[PDB]
């Protein structure tokens, strides 16, 4: 029964660790959204200064790629949570 | 007492699935970093033409290095996930 | 005893996998600081051409927060990783 006790201890820490990883993925999702936003504001001002100086700054796809990736990480966060719960049931 | 063997298998299954999702997450971050590096280049270029010189050369190159490291990580992880999956009894 | 051998193999690779993930998180943490730095430089220069208004102060401070937070996760995870490693029978 050294094995069964070791297994539950392992599973408990494996569950906590995937929970920690899940947070890092969350913080990364948010950091990525924050960047998308920064590119957004940059896109505005630089194009306004480009209009008062009268090259177009176009970051729309970079912006949308980043908000998509950010959403994708959220899917992962959800799918991971399901798996974490499953691990916890053993 | 072979509830323990049944528990071990389900656990390994979800751990394999869980590390696989985490690898998707890392892959998405790596590519996102390339997206940003691209974004920084465009910003650098456009701002210098409207013109202090905006120099993002080091940030851009740091970011593609980080992206390369993350990819290397994903490849290395993929092997380990399989090792884990072979342990089902 | 077949199960315990499988258990050890799994735990060993699970420990390796979490270490690979921890590298990824570390690399991501550092990339975010780099992003924050670049956004800072963009702000200065863009605001400087603006006087001859771009506000990114909070995003920069957000990204440096996430970056610090990511490091706290890694260091906590290493404690959990060792716990996993101690279970080897």
UniProtKB/Swiss-Prot annotation, chain B:
Q: Could you name the domain of life of the organism this protein comes from?
A: Viruses
Q: Where in the cell is it found?
A: Virion membrane; Host endoplasmic reticulum-Golgi intermediate compartment membrane
UniProt feature coiled coil, ranges: 52-89
- Tell me its family: Belongs to the alphacoronaviruses spike protein family.
As for what it does, the entry says: S1 region attaches the virion to the cell membrane by interacting with host ANPEP/aminopeptidase N, initiating the infection. Binding to the receptor probably induces conformational changes in the S glycoprotein unmasking the fusion peptide of S2 region and activating membranes fusion. S2 region belongs to the class I viral fusion protein. Under the current model, the protein has at least 3 conformational states: pre-fusion native state, pre-hairpin intermediate state, and post-fusion hairpin state.
Q: What does the entry note on its domains?
A: The KxHxx motif seems to function as an ER retrieval signal.
- Can you state the subunit structure given in the record? Homotrimer. During virus morphogenesis, found in a complex with M and HE proteins. Interacts with host ANPEP.
Name-wise, this protein is Spike glycoprotein
Q: What is the lineage of its organism?
A: Viruses, Riboviria, Orthornavirae, Pisuviricota, Pisoniviricetes
State which stretch of the full-length protein is shown. 791 to 1100 of 1173
